[PDB]
């Protein structure tokens, strides 16, 4: 159904060394398709996804310019900020930026955002209406004002509504056969020799995609949602991820406890 | 399609 194309470009300060390492990256539904990297022998926006080879040099050039340009912006900028934060030129920094548009299966845009951050803690962000500015601290509100003068909200909002959605609609078409693959998870349970004369049922799900997955331990319809310490959905390797669940259960009575795995790619939810 | 940024932060 609906989708999202977002870009997460960062800048790391290397004052003494010689130049910040502005690195950009691009995603279409949690899937990375382009990355730049201002430290490479040849700065080039190389295709990650396979479906991005079919574009051409016409499009691979038009990009690397936008790249080096923002490089300047992340440079020029980053510096003004040690002035704002009255920090002596030496402490490494990180100016970050993220943007994109979320489109409903229907076709029209649903929401778009832009956000900057300087060393983690938020610095400023456009609001939902695409017109307001949520500046973080005093040194950041300085910017909120200045941007309302040139009309940051009408410039960026412009890119959001049309173009971001426009190109998005292009990407999906080009990589349709790949992007919409929904790999279903594989069932697996486990019990361990824990010293308390207890057992540990481990509900193992592997090779799945997308990652948004629901997973719990049961006991008669009602779900043992409290004792099941589970993991943080982590990247297996090839492309399909994995997740696991835990419930400490003494012998004999074990057979009663169960696991359940919910995921967008199953015809009937799984009960193990 | 990365967009350009004029307005210096």
């Amino acid at each position: 159904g609906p989708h999202s194309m977002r870009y997460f470009e960062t800048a790391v300060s290397r004052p003494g060394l010689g130049e910040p390492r502005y690195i950009s990256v691009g995603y279409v539904d949690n899937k990375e398709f382009v990355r730049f990297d201002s430290d490479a022998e040849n700065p080039r926006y190389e295709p990650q996804a396979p479906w991005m080879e079919q574009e051409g040099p016409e499009y691979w050039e038009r990009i690397t310019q936008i790249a080096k340009g923002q490089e300047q912006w992340f440079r020029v900028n980053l510096r003004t900020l040690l002035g704002y934060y009255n920090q002596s030129a030496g402490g490494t920094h990180t100016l970050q930026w993220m943007y994109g548009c979320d489109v409903g299966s229907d076709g029209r845009l649903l929401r778009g955002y832009e956000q900057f951050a300087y060393d983690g803690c938020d610095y400023i962000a456009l609001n939902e209406d695409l017109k307001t500015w949520t500046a973080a601290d005093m040194a950041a509100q300085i910017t909120r004002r200045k941007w309302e003068q040139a009309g940051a909200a009408e410039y960026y909002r412009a890119y959001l509504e049309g173009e971001c959605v426009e190109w998005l609609h292009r990407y999906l078409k080009n990589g349709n056969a790949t992007l919409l693959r929904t790999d279903s998870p594989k069932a697996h349970v486990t019990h361990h020799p824990r010293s308390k004369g207890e057992v540990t049922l481990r509900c193992w799900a592997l090779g799945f995609y997308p990652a948004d997955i629901t997973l719990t331990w049961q006991l008669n319809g009602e779900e043992l949602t409290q004792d099941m310490e589970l993991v943080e959905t982590r990247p297996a390797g090839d492309g399909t991820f994995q997740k696991w669940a835990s419930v400490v259960v003494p012998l004999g009575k074990e057979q009663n406890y169960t696991c359940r795995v919910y995921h967008e790619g199953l015809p009937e939810p799984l009960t193990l | 399609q990365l967009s350009p940024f004029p307005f210096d932060l």
Partner: protein
């Protein structure tokens, strides 16, 4: 501001000692991005490693995924070392088979 590296370790498949597997070492929530990683085994630094997906979630936290070509043997023991400004000395995670 600094956020400390959460280290997770795990194989790419259920391990049955012998079969050439891919031992990962996923990181999360470290910041600033400058982090040192080291793949180990009984203390001999594993020479061949990886560095993929160096990106960041909305929480402005940079991460990575490193993996070597480990091979399970009930007698040996693997691990993953990592240095990151937001801590006095490097933390070490020896891998537990069924995790």
């Amino acid at each position: 501001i600094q956020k400390t590296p959460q280290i997770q370790v795990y194989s790419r498949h259920p391990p049955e000692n012998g079969k050439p597997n891919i031992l990962n070492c996923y990181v999360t929530q470290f910041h600033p991005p400058h982090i040192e990683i080291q793949m180990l085994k009984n203390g001999k630094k594993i020479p061949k490693v990886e560095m993929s997906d160096m990106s960041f979630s909305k929480d402005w936290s940079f991460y990575i995924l490193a993996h070597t070509e480990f091979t399970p043997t009930e007698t040996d023991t693997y691990a993953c070392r990592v240095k990151h400004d937001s801590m006095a000395e490097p933390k070490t995670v020896y891998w537990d088979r069924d995790m």
